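Re-running the complex after MR caught last week's input typo. The corrected sequence lines follow. Everything else is unchanged.
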Amino acid sequence: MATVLTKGEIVLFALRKFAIASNASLTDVEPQSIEDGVNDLEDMMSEWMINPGDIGYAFATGDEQPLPDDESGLPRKYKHAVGYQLLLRMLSDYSLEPTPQVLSNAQRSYDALMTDTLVVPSMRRRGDFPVGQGNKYDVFTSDRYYPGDL
Amino acid sequence: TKLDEQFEKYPKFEINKVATELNRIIAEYRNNRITVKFRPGDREASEELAN
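Corrected-run output:
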């Protein structure tokens, strides 16, 4: 994609959005808070394979370790949602509580992500339900009664 | 419609209710069939001619 999201960029976004490590609040950044953040992101993405479903995350192949310089594989349309969810999960490390505006932003981004993965399964006919004489089950098609399976 | 990458077709039931009166009309004629007659005239020999 456009510039390719790395796993370190997402955790830096989350750290910046609450004024923990950025150049436009005071100063500073730590190296352990990065490994902790990246591991938290990996575990979150593992969990998301259940409720929100797969979104294309690129996991580490074999054991090794994630490393912040690895390519995430996510489209750029998801970074705000992922970053806000990660910030919500990792706020309590520093003993902080989110403000209402942060919660509102997180909910809006999550809703945008949810809208892009809908299915609406569209239930089918049963299998003992007849198909009428009107569509000529003898000659044109075969098998009067719907299959309703496959 | 497609219906999740398939082509299920709409059920089309047929309940024929317009043929009963038509059958009644056709039975009415097949009961009384009618044909040509060749009526006679006013003449000495037209009776045998018509017969």
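None of the earlier attempt is carried over here. The helical segments of chain B are 20-31, 46-50. The first helix of chain B runs from residue 20 to 31.
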